[PDB]
Amino acid sequence: ASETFTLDEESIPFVPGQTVLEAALAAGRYIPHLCWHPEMGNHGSCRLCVVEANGRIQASCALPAQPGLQVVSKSETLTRVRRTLLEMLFAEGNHFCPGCEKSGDCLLQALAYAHGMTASHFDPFYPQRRIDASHPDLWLDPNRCILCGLCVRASLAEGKEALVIGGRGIASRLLATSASGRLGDTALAATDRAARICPVGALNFKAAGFTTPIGKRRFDHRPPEAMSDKERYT
Amino acid sequence: RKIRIATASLAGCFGCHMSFADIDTRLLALAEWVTFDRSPLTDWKTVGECDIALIEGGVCNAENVEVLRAYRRAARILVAVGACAINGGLPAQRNQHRVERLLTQVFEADRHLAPGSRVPNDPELPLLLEHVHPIHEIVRVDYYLPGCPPTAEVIWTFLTDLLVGREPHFPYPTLRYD
Amino acid sequence: TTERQRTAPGLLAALHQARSPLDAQALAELSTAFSLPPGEIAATASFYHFFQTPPARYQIHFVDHVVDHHAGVAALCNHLCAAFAIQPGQRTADARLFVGWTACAGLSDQAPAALINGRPMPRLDAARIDALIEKIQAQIPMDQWPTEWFAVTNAIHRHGPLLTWLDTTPAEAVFEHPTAHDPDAILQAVTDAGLRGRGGAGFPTATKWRFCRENADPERFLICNADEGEPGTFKDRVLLTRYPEHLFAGMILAARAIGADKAILYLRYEYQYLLPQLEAARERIASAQATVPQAERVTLEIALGAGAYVCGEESALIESLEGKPGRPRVRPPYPVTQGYLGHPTVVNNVETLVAVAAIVGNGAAWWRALGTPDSSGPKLFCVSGDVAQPGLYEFPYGVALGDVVTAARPLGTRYAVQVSGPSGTLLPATPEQLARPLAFEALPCNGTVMVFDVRRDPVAIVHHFARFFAHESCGFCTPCRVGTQLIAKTFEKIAAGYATRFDLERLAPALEAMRLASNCGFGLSAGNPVRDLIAHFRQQLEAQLQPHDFIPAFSLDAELAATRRLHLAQFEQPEV
Amino acid sequence: SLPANATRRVAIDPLSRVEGHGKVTIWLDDDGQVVEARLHIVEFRGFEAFIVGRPYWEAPVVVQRLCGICPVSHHLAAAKALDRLVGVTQLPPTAEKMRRLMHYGQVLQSHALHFFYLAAPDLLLGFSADPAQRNVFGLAAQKRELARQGILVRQFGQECIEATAGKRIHGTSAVPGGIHKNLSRRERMALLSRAPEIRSWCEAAVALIERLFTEHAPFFAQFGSFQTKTFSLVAADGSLDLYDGTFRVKEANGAILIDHYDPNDYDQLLVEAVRPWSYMKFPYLKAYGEPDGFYRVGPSARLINCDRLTTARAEAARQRFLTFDQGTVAHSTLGYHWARLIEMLHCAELIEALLTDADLEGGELRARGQRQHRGVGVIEAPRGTLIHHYEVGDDDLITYCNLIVSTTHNNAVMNQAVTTAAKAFLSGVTLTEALLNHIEVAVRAFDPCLSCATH
Ligand SMILES: Cc1cc2nc3c(=O)[nH]c(=O)nc-3n(C[C@H](O)[C@H](O)[C@H](O)COP(=O)(O)O)c2cc1C
Ligand code: SF4
Numbered sequence A: 001a002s003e004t005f006t007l008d009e010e011s012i013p014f015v016p017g018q019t020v021l022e023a024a025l026a027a028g029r030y031i032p033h034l035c036w037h038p039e040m041g042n043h044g045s046c047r048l049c050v051v052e053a054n055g056r057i058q059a060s061c062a063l064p065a066q067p068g069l070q071v072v073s074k075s076e077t078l079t080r081v082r083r084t085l086l087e088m089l090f091a092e093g094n095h096f097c098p099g100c101e102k103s104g105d106c107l108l109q110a111l112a113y114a115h116g117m118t119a120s121h122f123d124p125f126y127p128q129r130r131i132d133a134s135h136p137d138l139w140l141d142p143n144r145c146i147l148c149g150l151c152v153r154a155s156l157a158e159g160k161e162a163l164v165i166g167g168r169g170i171a172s173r174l175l176a177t178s179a180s181g182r183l184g185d186t187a188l189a190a191t192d193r194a195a196r197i198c199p200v201g202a203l204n205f206k207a208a209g210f211t212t213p214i215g216k217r218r219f220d221h222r223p224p225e226a227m228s229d230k231e232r233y234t
Numbered sequence B: 001r002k003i004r005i006a007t008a009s010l011a012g013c014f015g016c017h018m019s020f021a022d023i024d025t026r027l028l029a030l031a032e033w034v035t036f037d038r039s040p041l042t043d044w045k046t047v048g049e050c051d052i053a054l055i056e057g058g059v060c061n062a063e064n065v066e067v068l069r070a071y072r073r074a075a076r077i078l079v080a081v082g083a084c085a086i087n088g089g090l091p092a093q094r095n096q097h098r099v100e101r102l103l104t105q106v107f108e109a110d111r112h113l114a115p116g117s118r119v120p121n122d123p124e125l126p127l128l129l130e131h132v133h134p135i136h137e138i139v140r141v142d143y144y145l146p147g148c149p150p151t152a153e154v155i156w157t158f159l160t161d162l163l164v165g166r167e168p169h170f171p172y173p174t175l176r177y178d
Numbered sequence C: 001t002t003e004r005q006r007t008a009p010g011l012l013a014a015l016h017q018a019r020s021p022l023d024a025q026a027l028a029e030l031s032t033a034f035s036l037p038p039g040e041i042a043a044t045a046s047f048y049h050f051f052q053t054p055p056a057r058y059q060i061h062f063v064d065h066v067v068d069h070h071a072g073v074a075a076l077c078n079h080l081c082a083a084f085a086i087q088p089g090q091r092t093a094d095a096r097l098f099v100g101w102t103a104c105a106g107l108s109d110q111a112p113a114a115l116i117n118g119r120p121m122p123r124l125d126a127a128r129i130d131a132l133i134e135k136i137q138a139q140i141p142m143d144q145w146p147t148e149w150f151a152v153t154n155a156i157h158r159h160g161p162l163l164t165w166l167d168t169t170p171a172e173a174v175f176e177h178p179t180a181h182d183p184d185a186i187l188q189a190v191t192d193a194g195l196r197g198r199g200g201a202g203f204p205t206a207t208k209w210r211f212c213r214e215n216a217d218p219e220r221f222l223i224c225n226a227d228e229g230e231p232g233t234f235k236d237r238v239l240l241t242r243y244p245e246h247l248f249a250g251m252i253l254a255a256r257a258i259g260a261d262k263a264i265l266y267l268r269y270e271y272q273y274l275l276p277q278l279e280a281a282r283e284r285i286a287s288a289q290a291t292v293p294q295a296e297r298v299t300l301e302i303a304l305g306a307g308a309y310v311c312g313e314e315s316a317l318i319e320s321l322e323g324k325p326g327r328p329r330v331r332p333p334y335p336v337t338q339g340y341l342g343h344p345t346v347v348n349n350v351e352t353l354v355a356v357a358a359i360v361g362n363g364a365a366w367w368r369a370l371g372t373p374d375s376s377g378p379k380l381f382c383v384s385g386d387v388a389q390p391g392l393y394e395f396p397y398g399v400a401l402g403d404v405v406t407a408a409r410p411l412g413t414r415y416a417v418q419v420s421g422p423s424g425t426l427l428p429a430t431p432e433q434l435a436r437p438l439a440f441e442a443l444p445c446n447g448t449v450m451v452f453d454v455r456r457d458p459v460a461i462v463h464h465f466a467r468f469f470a471h472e473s474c475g476f477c478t479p480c481r482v483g484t485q486l487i488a489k490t491f492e493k494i495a496a497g498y499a500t501r502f503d504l505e506r507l508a509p510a511l512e513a514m515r516l517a518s519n520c521g522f523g524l525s526a527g528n529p530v531r532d533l534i535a536h537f538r539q540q541l542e543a544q545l546q547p548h549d550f551i552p553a554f555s556l557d558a559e560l561a562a563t564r565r566l567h568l569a570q571f572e573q574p575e576v
Numbered sequence D: 001s002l003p004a005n006a007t008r009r010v011a012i013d014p015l016s017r018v019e020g021h022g023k024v025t026i027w028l029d030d031d032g033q034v035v036e037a038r039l040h041i042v043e044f045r046g047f048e049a050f051i052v053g054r055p056y057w058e059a060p061v062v063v064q065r066l067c068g069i070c071p072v073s074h075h076l077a078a079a080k081a082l083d084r085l086v087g088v089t090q091l092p093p094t095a096e097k098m099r100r101l102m103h104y105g106q107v108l109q110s111h112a113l114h115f116f117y118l119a120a121p122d123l124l125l126g127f128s129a130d131p132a133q134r135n136v137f138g139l140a141a142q143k144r145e146l147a148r149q150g151i152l153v154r155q156f157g158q159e160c161i162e163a164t165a166g167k168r169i170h171g172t173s174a175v176p177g178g179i180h181k182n183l184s185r186r187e188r189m190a191l192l193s194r195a196p197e198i199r200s201w202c203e204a205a206v207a208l209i210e211r212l213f214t215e216h217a218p219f220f221a222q223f224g225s226f227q228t229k230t231f232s233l234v235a236a237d238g239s240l241d242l243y244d245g246t247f248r249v250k251e252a253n254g255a256i257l258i259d260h261y262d263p264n265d266y267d268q269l270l271v272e273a274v275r276p277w278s279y280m281k282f283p284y285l286k287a288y289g290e291p292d293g294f295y296r297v298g299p300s301a302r303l304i305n306c307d308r309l310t311t312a313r314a315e316a317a318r319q320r321f322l323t324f325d326q327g328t329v330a331h332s333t334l335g336y337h338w339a340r341l342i343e344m345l346h347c348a349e350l351i352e353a354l355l356t357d358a359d360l361e362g363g364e365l366r367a368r369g370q371r372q373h374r375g376v377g378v379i380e381a382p383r384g385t386l387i388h389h390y391e392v393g394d395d396d397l398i399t400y401c402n403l404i405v406s407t408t409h410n411n412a413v414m415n416q417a418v419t420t421a422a423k424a425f426l427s428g429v430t431l432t433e434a435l436l437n438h439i440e441v442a443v444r445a446f447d448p449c450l451s452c453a454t455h
C-alpha cells in the first residue's frame, strides 16, 4: 500500500485498484456489508455498503479508491438508508428468528441489531416458497435467502456450477441448475465451499441445528464491526 | 397520583407477560409506584384510562382489534411488547396459508378426529382475519420492545426509563429477536 | 468466475428460435450448444415476459397501460375471457387460447390494444373482440385474419426541420458529404452540435464517444437502443417505421466515429412486426458504405428482445445480448471502457442516432440553431391520452408544455399531464406548470406527454404505474426489488378502501433508499409517481385514507424536500 | 346444538387471572335459572397444519411459542418425540438429568405462578373482594411476606430452567437424542444453595392450604365433585414421574381400568371430538365412547393415580390430602389447589436432591440411533398429560403433526364444573361482579392452559 484516501476524515492506505470497501476493511475500518466476501468479491446486490462520495451516495464495494478521494461512510442519512435496507430484507422473506436455527449466527440479524432495528415498519410479504430438501445432506429455505449470490459464486469458483439465481423482480430466487431443478440432482456436496458460505439461514446443513447454547453463539457478544475475518465470514 | 398501567395479551402466548413477571421481587417495588388497570393479572373486564399500555400479541380476529383500539384510546403511551405484537410472531406463520384450509386440516381431515367431525363455526367464535397483523397496522405505537420474549432486564430497564421520563435506548447486546 | 462472466451471446436468439414448448429435450440441446446447465438456461429465460407464456395456439396479451385502461381495455379483456371461461393469466384446457397482460407495447396513440402471437392489434372494441372470438372458436389461422386488424398508424401532426429533412433527403445522401469520410470530423460535428441523448438520460453524445475512443482496445461496438419501453413512448416506433434507412445510416456514422467493426440494433419484442422492413432497409444501407470497404466497413446486425423494460437500461441491454438476465451491471467498469464481451461499447437511442445522420448532413450550426443553448436541436414528442389528435409532434427543445398539450387538442377540461412517461413527472394542468419549457435544463422530457382530463383519478394512475415498476424491476438490488413491491401493495390497500395515513407515510424511507441505494436509474424513476402524487394531489390522496396518528421519523414531506423542491446519467456514465 | 329452552345469554369474556384467552357463557331460562354453562376457546393458530414442511429439528424450539408458562413442557415433549424419531429411547445420564431439572423447575414455577399470582387472591382475600385488590398486587399489599416467598419460589424454578435451557422462556438445549449443554460447577452450587429454603417455603404453602380447607371445606364443597375417570402418566413402579412414563386410567372409584399403556399408541387409546362452539377439542377413550370415555387430568388426577410420590414430605402431604373429609376434596373442583401445592413441594424436594448429582456436570450429553419416520413424546405438564406426535419424511421435513394438550383433556369436566358453579351461585339471580367471579374461581381451580389450547 503506497497511495491513500480519506474515510471519515481519516487516512486509509490502498493498493490500485482496490475498491473503497476492500481498502477500508484491510485497514480495520468497518463499512456494513452482506454480499461482499474475501474469497468471492462483491455481488453488488445488498446495498448496505453505500457511502457518500463525489458527491453522491454510491456502493463502496463498487467505488474504486482514488488518491485523496473523500468518502463518508457514517452519517445520519446513511444510517437511515441502511436501516431501511435491512427492514426491506426482513419484509420480503419469512425472517421469523424465534423459529430459525441460524439465530445468533446470522449476519442479517446481527446487522439489524447493530442498526438498532427495534421493528421493521414495512408490511411483510409472507412468501410461500417451499424448502428444497432433495439433497441428502443439505437443504435450502428460499424464504430466508437474501439473494447475496455468494453460494452461486462459490459453486462456480470450485467448478460444480450447481446453483443459479433466476426469475425477475420479486420472483427472483435461488435454484438448482439440474434439469429436474432439485439440489439433489446437482453435483453439489456437503464438502463444497458453497454449502457453508451462506451468511443467513437459507442454505444449510441438515440435522446440525441448535448445537450452540444461548450466550455462546457467534454474534451474541460482539457485533460485526468488532469481529475478525475468521469469525465474520464463513 | 400514581402512574397507571394496563396490559393486554392479544394474539400472543402469554410469554411476554411471564417475562414481565421475571422481574421477580421487583414487582413488589413496581406495585408501590403504579396501579394496574385491565390486565390478565387483574379482574377489570374493561380498560381505561391509563398512562402506559403494554400490548403483547398481534391481531388475529375482530375482537382483538376492538380491544387493541380500545387500549389505544385509553392509554397515553402504547408499547408493542414482543415479536408477536411487533411483527406478528408465531401466529403470523399461518399467513403463508389460507386459514380455511388450516381449519379443515385440523378439524375435519385429521386422522384422530371422531367420525363426522366438522370445522367449528358458532356465534361464540369471532371472525378470523385473513392475515394475522402486528399491532402497528391498526394503531399508533409509541415504543417497540423487541424479543421473544424480551428479557426481564430489558423490560425492567425500559419501564423504569418511562417512569422517570428518560428516553428508552436499545444497545446492541440487549437487543434480540428470539 | 462470477455470475456475470457466464456469457452465452447467441442465446436470446436461440430461445426465440426454439419457440417456433421449452421442454427438457430443448433445454438439453441449448445446454450442449452454450455449455451451461439446463436450469441455468431456463433461469435466464424466466427473466423475459414473452418466454414465460404458457404455450397455446393463440397467445393474446392485452396492453396493461394507463391510456388503454382509460379507453376501456379491461372490459374487452373480460369480454373475451368470459367467452372461453378463463381468467386473465391462464389458458384454456385444450391449449387453444391464452389470455394475459403485458406493459405498454408502443401503441399509446392507438389504445386500447393487444398483442396476439407477437403481432399488434390496436384500436380494439367490442365488435373486434366478438369477431376475434369467432375466429378462435372456429380455429381460423392468423394467416387468413384481415390484415387491417394489424395496421399500426404513425400519424405525424407537426413537421419541423428534422422530419422535413428526413422526407426530402434519401438516407444514403449523407455518405457523399465530406464529413462522412472522416471519423474525427463526425465526432467534431456531433460535439459542436451539442447533441444530448434522446433515451431519457440526456448525456452529451460527444463525451460518451470520446470515452469509447480513448481505449487501447481496437475492437469496439455501437449499439442502437430500440427497446422503447417507457410507457406512453412511441417516438422511436415512428422513426423505425418511416425512416429505418436513416437510422442505419446514423448507426454507420456513429460506428465509424468510434471505430467499431460491428453495429447492433436492439429491437424490443413488441416491434418484431417491423423486422421485415428493417432487414430490407439494412441490406440497402449496407451497400451505401464508402469509404472504406471492404475491411473498414461496419457490419449491421439486429437482435430481438423478449419483454423487459429494464433491458432498455444501457448495461442491462448488453447483458441481454450476452445471453444473461437483463440485470444492470455493477459499475465501474462502464460499458464505454468494458461493454459487450469486454470491448469498449457505446449505446445510443434510435432518435439520437437519427440526429447524428442529420448533423452530418447539414452540419453543427444547423442543429445548434434550434432549441435552447443547453438543450440543442429539434425534439420529437409522442402525445397521447385524452386528446383529439394523438401522434408525433416535432418541436424545438424549449417549447412550453402547454403548447404541446394544446397542439393535440385536449378532449375534456385539462387536469393532469404525465411528462416523460411514468419515470418523469405527473403534473396538474395549471398555467404555471404549462408555461414550463420542455428541456433538460427545466422540465425534462424524452418526448412522451400523456394528457388526462377531469374524469381521471390521479391516485388510480399512480397505482397503474406502481404495478408497472413492481413487475419490471430486474430484482437485483434490495431497495428496488423490495421497494417497488411495497409501493404497489400500499396502493392495493388504497384501492380496497382500508388504507390509513400510516400505510402511506411508511413508504417515505423506502423512497429515499430507492433513490440513493439502487444500482441503476430504475430505483429513482420508480418513486416519482408517488412523490409527484403527494406534491400535487395530496388532498385527492388523503381523501381515500383512514385516520391514523403515526409520527414518522422520516416523513413524506422530507422525501419531497430532498427531490422535487430544489442526474439519471449518474448511474450510467463516469463523470467529467 | 343447545337444546332447548335457554332464553338469556350472559358472558364472562375475557376470563381473568388465567393463562391465555378464554370465555365462559352462562345460559338462563325465563325464570332466571341456569340451564347450562360453557367454556369457550375462541382463538386459532393452526400450528399442526402450518408446521408441515419445516425440518424436524426446528420443532422443539418453535412449538414452545404456543405458551407462555409451559414452553419447557412443549420443548421436552417435542424433544422426546424427536428422540424416538432418531432411534433413541433411553437418554444418556447428563441429558436425562438436565431435562428432569428443566422440567421439575418448570412445574415448580408454573404452580407457584398460578397459586400466588392467579388463584390465591381469591382464596386469601375473599371471593367477593373488591376487583381493585383481588389480584397479586392487593395480596402483596396485605400479605407481603407470603407474596414475596411465592415470587421467589417461581424465580427459583425459572432459574433452574435458564441454567438448563439457556433462558427462562423459550430456550433451545433439548435436542434429538439428548441435551446440547451441561451445568457449570458454580451454576449447580448456586442453585443447590437456594434449594432447601425454597422447599421449606413450599412446606409452609402446603400447611397454609390445609388450614384454608379445614376452615372452609363445606363452603368449597359447593363448587362440585367429579365422578369421572382420572388420566395420567405413571412410572413402571408405578409412582408419579412428571418427566416420563406410560398411561394409567382409573375410574372415579379407581379401580384401575388401564395401566402401563404405551403412549406411542395413544392413537389407538384416544379420539378427539369437536363441538361447534369451541376450537378446543374433546378427547375420550375410544373403547368407551363419549361421554362414558371422558376423563380428567392435572394435579389431583396424578395424586389419585399414583401408588406413591418418590419424595417423603410430598408423600406425607398427599396422604393427608386423600384422607381429608373424607376423600371428598380429592375429587373436588377446588381440591386441585391443594393437590397443586403438594406437587410444588414434590418438585422442590426432587430438585433439592437432583442438584447434588454430579452427572449434571457430565459429558454424556447425546445419543445416536436408527432413524424412523414416526415420533411420539408424552410428558406430565403442570396441568396434565401432554402429547406431541410428529411424522417426518426421508426429506427431514415434517409431514404430520398432532398436539393434544393438557387442557384439551380437561375440556368436558371444566364445562361440567362451570355448570355446577353457575347453578350453585347464579340460579339465585340477580348477577353481580362478585358472584360471576365465583364462576371464574371454578375455572381457575383447573389452572387451564388456554394459550397451549390455542394452537
Ligand atoms: C429502467 C430504464 C429503462 C430505460 N429504457 C430505455 C429505452 O427503452 N430506450 C432508450 O433509448 N433508453 C432507455 N434508458 C436509458 C438508456 O440508458 C439509454 O439507452 C442511454 O441513456 C442511451 O443514451 P443516448 O440517449 O445518448 O442514446 C432506460 C434507462 C432506465 C434506467
Ligand atoms: S435467517 Fe437470520 S434474520 Fe432470517 S430468521 Fe434466521 S436468524 Fe432471523
Ligand code: SF4
Residues within 6 Å of the ligand: A144, A145, A146, A147, A148, A149, A150, A151, A152, A174, A197, A198, A199, A200, A202, A203
Ligand atoms: S442461499 Fe445464502 S448464500 Fe445463497 S444467495 Fe441466498 S443468502 Fe446468499
Ligand code: SF4
Residues within 6 Å of the ligand: B011, B012, B013, B014, B015, B016, B017, B056, B057, B081, B082, B083, B084, B085, B089, B090, B147, B148, B149, B150, D065, D066, D067, D068
Ligand atoms: S413474543 Fe414470543 S414470548 Fe411474547 S407472546 Fe409472542 S411468542 Fe410469546
Ligand code: SF4
Residues within 6 Å of the ligand: C310, C327, C328, C472, C473, C474, C475, C476, C477, C478, C480, C481, C518, C519, C520, C521, C522, C523
Ligand atoms: S434498481 Fe431495480 S432495475 Fe436497477 S439494478 Fe436494482 S433491482 Fe435491478
Ligand code: FCO
Residues within 6 Å of the ligand: D067, D070, D073, D074, D381, D382, D383, D384, D386, D405, D406, D407, D408, D449, D452, D453
Ligand atoms: N401445563 C401446561 Fe400447557 C398445556 N396444556 C402445556 O404443555
Ligand code: FES
Residues within 6 Å of the ligand: A032, A033, A034, A035, A036, A042, A043, A044, A045, A046, A047, A048, A049, A050, A059, A060, A061, A062
Ligand atoms: S457489499 Fe456492496 S452491495 Fe453488498
Ligand SMILES: [Mg+2]
Residues within 6 Å of the ligand: D048, D402, D403, D404, D405, D455
Ligand atoms: Mg391439537
Ligand code: 3NI
Residues within 6 Å of the ligand: D019, D067, D068, D069, D070, D448, D449, D450, D451, D452, D453
Ligand atoms: Ni400453557
